């Protein structure tokens, strides 16, 4: 896996297949987390 993509050597990132017709649970969702004096 020394710089060469192949079997058992995968690129670490994968995109989401977001489409308007892709059910409910496969739709894109916007998430904001507000993590907790000024």
């Amino acid at each position: 896996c020394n710089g060469v993509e192949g079997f058992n050597c995968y690129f670490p990132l994968q995109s989401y297949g977001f489409q308007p017709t892709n059910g409910v649970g496969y739709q894109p969702y916007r998430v904001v987390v507000l993590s907790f004096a000024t």
Partner: antibody
């Protein structure tokens, strides 16, 4: 991951030509090394392969007995020699690196070298 | 050692694509570990799909290395003008002596 292929030139039919490919940016002797050729205006034709350690070689039947592959793991490169080269064998030859499950087909491709026979 | 493809496909921008490939005998399965390549004029062929369905890092995620009814395919979820290219398939057989299909030309309307 770069594959540098050369050796293509204008040659006469009935003769022979040795093509070569050098590896750069990756380990040579960990992957299978492929050869593919494409005649202008045509699709891709499978020509040959060689196993990681050179113990096995594979050819498309159409070049069997004419094409030979050898390699030098200390130079990170391989050579393809084609004997009894036909006038019909005008094509760009490409070097490809196979890191897949079986090693039969390449993932990375070089720029190719043109072989013209006249 | 015979592989066939649909000679050409025309797709409207944003439309889907189904490019197909297969062997004259048996059926295409994961055991053929099918490969798909894309070639633009002046360029070397670039592998998009390897080992049936694995997609490369340089390949747009709009492309999908799916299989059909005993056939290999390369589909698109929405084609773009940038995708105009000749596409090629390669199947394994009894060993590492693969056979390419005739080539399938994809254009965008």
């Amino acid at each position: 991951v770069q594959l540098v292929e050369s050796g293509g030139d204008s040659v006469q039919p009935g003769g022979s030509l040795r093509l070569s490919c050098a590896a750069a940016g990756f380990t040579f002797s960990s992957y299978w090394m492929n050869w593919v050729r494409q005649a202008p205006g045509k699709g891709l034709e499978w020509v040959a392969n060689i196993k990681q350690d050179g113990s096995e070689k594979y050819y498309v039947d159409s070049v069997k007995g004419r094409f030979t592959i050898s390699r030098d793991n200390a130079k990170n490169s391989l050579y393809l020699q084609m004997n009894s080269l036909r006038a019909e064998d005008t094509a760009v030859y490409y070097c490809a690196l196979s890191s897949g499950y079986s090693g039969y087909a390449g993932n990375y491709w070089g720029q190719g070298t043109l072989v013209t026979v006249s | 050692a015979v592989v066939t493809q649909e000679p050409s496909l025309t797709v409207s921008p944003g439309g889907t694509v189904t490019l197909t490939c297969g062997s004259s005998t048996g059926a295409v399965t994961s055991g053929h570990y099918p490969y798909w390549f894309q070639q633009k004029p002046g360029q070397a062929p670039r592998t998009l799909i390897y080992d049936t369905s694995n997609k490369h890092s340089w390949t747009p995620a709009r492309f999908s290395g799916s299989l059909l009814g005993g056939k290999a395919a390369l589909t698109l979820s929405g084609a773009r003008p940038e995708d105009e290219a000749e596409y090629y398939c390669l199947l394994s057989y009894s060993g590492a002596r693969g056979v390419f299909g005739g080539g399938t030309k994809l254009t965008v309307l």
